[PDB]
Subunit: 202 residues, 3 copies
């Protein structure tokens, strides 16, 4: 027989999730913070976390296949805390699966993909805990997704995908206010997307 | 292709799980008449107990009685409309390993669903739990989940979530407990036919 | 209908996972996995390190004193021996199966002495150390990490020093190799 697995999602998305690093002058340069990013398309556009690349002397993007790029910050967005990078790839880029017709449902099994404590790309699984909106009017457009898929420093900017490897959101920061568990957030993919397209227009 | 999901169990059980506050734990609308279960410590020495359903309705609830030997309490609300109730299959045998979902109101963030499995069904002899019939789960439990529901992939009530374990040396992960539904169904009827 | 479950995995593997005590009193605790019927159990070295007496307890209630037969500094794995008055349950092993990231996996050990507990996660990474998010806590060391078929994927070790859902395991291949090396003596 075959083991229960969410390996089909891991194979379709893991390759498009890169390791992001923020290096700054101390000569002598070092890593201020590190996060993750999702290669959106073969033009070299990546979506990451704004707090991960803020005040960066050098932005280093590292794919899973060994390739290391020096990236360019195209622009970030405050309301959602997203930032968009750009790399110059010539050998072909692995991209994240996207299904624009899909609508995320509470309970859907979801996988978080990121670089917790720089231990190297890790995959954690949970479900979509809730979906809401932060801002004026609770009935407004969905702003965030909540998941219990373990999130840690280094996951910021990463991808939230369902069991078909489809993009559901861009992991953000976790929750902290005793010592909470299984509470993490992401920006819906339909929103992450619309912002990128905007930003890619300067 | 269809995405793997537990949304079914959710649509079935979440409507029946309420937000408890006073003038903030959680609760489960056991049956039509308006009987709501919760933990006795959730409502202990509280003033006006307020109960908010996921459909936005809000009611005042009266403590129809709690039970110290199980840390459970039963509340009553007089609703005019129809009420949502938690699915309950009395012929179901909870097994260790069954996928389970915890529904509650963590840090008053709004109703959330967390998934884990049934870690244990009970315990033999002295133990950190202090009890024998506790259902142990690794589905994320936080302050506010107390009193909420523990359901399986069909939305059936497995137990009533209880106080979080946040320890004697370091912060534990994936350790939560729930009171068996079979025990809550007993304690409900008793506190009911007892006034 | 029937609830989605990983009980099959529990039934197959859990009987073989034991609770290891380091005594005297209790200086520390962990878990172990019965590699074969005669009573050979694998656990981690740090759990039974410097023990006046090694107590092993089966999930069925029986309690046996253990003999530290040997260990391996390299992988931090130790081997214990107990004499059961009959054949003992063994952890399922399938040397032909290749662990994949994303594979559902269960953690079986004795967290905070609560008693045997099963937590679930997935293989988060395979980069000779396996990484999983199946909740691991103090007392889980030396325990079993199995997939949905009860097959052994690894011996859980010590967690990540607050980080959430980061735990590692020593590949079952290594445990198998280390068990044969010590039984042969």
């Amino acid at each position: 027989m075959t083991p229960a697995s969410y390996n089909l999602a891991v194979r379709r998305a893991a390759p498009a999730v890169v390791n992001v690093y923020n290096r700054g002058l101390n000569n002598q340069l070092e890593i201020r913070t590190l996060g993750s990013g999702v290669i959106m398309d073969q033009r070299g556009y990546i979506i990451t976390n704004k707090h991960v690349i803020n005040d960066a002397d050098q932005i280093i993007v590292a794919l899973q296949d060994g390739r290391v790029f020096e990236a360019l910050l195209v622009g970030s967005d405050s309301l959602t805390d997203l930032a968009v990078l750009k790399i110059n790839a010539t050998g072909g880029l692995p991209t994240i699966p996207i299904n624009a017709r899909r609508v995320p449902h509470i309970g859907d099994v979801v996988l978080a993909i990121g670089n917790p404590y720089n231990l190297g790309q890790t995959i954690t699984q949970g479900i979509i805990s809730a979906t809401g909106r932060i801002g004026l009017n609770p009935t407004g457009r969905q702003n965030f997704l909540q998941t219990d898929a373990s999130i840690n420093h280094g996951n910021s900017g990463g991808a939230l995908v369902n069991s078909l490897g489809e993009l559901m959101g861009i992991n953000t920061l976790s929750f902290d206010k005793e010592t909470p568990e299984g509470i993490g957030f992401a920006i819906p993919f339909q929103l992450a997307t619309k912002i990128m397209d905007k930003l890619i227009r300067d």
